[PDB]
Design a protein around this ligand. Structure first.
Ligand code: CL
Ligand code: CL
Ligand code: CL
Ligand code: MG
Ligand code: MG
Ligand code: RB
Ligand code: RB
Ligand code: RB
Ligand code: RB
Ligand code: RB
Ligand code: RB
Length: 136
RNA sequence: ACAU
DNA sequence: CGATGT
């Protein structure tokens, strides 16, 4: 119903899907950019949305913050819940980097604990997520 | 259908 | 119009 303003919002951005993938996290209240991943030459939207949430988890844990995370990715929310990124992207030489980061993200999920709520950003009611890359 |  | 995913 209402936006939890005391929160972190994340989102992927891409050039092509599959294509060049990046992501970032912002303070929901102010839009301040809190982290940004350097672009990855080939990945999918869902892999980047997944990496963005996991990075958010690590970021908040390191800072002893109990803020929730907003994501507008139904897929990535489920993947993080499952601790398993069910991407269809081919594993080959040119996708090695994104797949390494996804594999390492799952590994982190499987070796650490967190209570961070991971919440659906309700775009239909609230407009676009504040971490969005005005590209779509 | 939904995330879009 | 094309894509990745449930
Ligand atoms: Cl990452
Ligand atoms: Cl919450
Ligand atoms: Cl969801
Ligand atoms: Mg998104
Ligand atoms: Mg977006
Ligand atoms: Rb900590
Ligand atoms: Rb966008
Ligand atoms: Rb957009
Ligand atoms: Rb669509
Ligand atoms: Rb969206
Ligand atoms: Rb579809």
């Amino acid at each position: 119903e209402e936006i939890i303003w005391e929160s972190l919002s994340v989102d992927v951005g891409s050039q092509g899907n599959p294509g060049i993938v990046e992501y970032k996290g912002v303070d929901t209240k102010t839009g301040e950019v809190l982290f940004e991943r350097e672009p990855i030459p080939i990945g999918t939207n869902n892999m980047g949305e997944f990496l963005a949430i996991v990075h958010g988890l690590r970021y908040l844990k390191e800072r002893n913050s109990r803020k929730p995370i907003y994501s507008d990715s139904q897929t990535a929310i489920k993947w993080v819940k499952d601790k398993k990124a069910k991407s269809t992207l081919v594993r080959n030489e040119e996708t090695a980097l994104i797949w390494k980061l996804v594999d390492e993200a799952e590994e982190w999920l499987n070796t650490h604990t967190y209570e961070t709520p991971i919440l659906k950003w309700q775009t239909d009611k609230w407009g676009e997520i504040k971490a969005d890359y005005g590209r779509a």
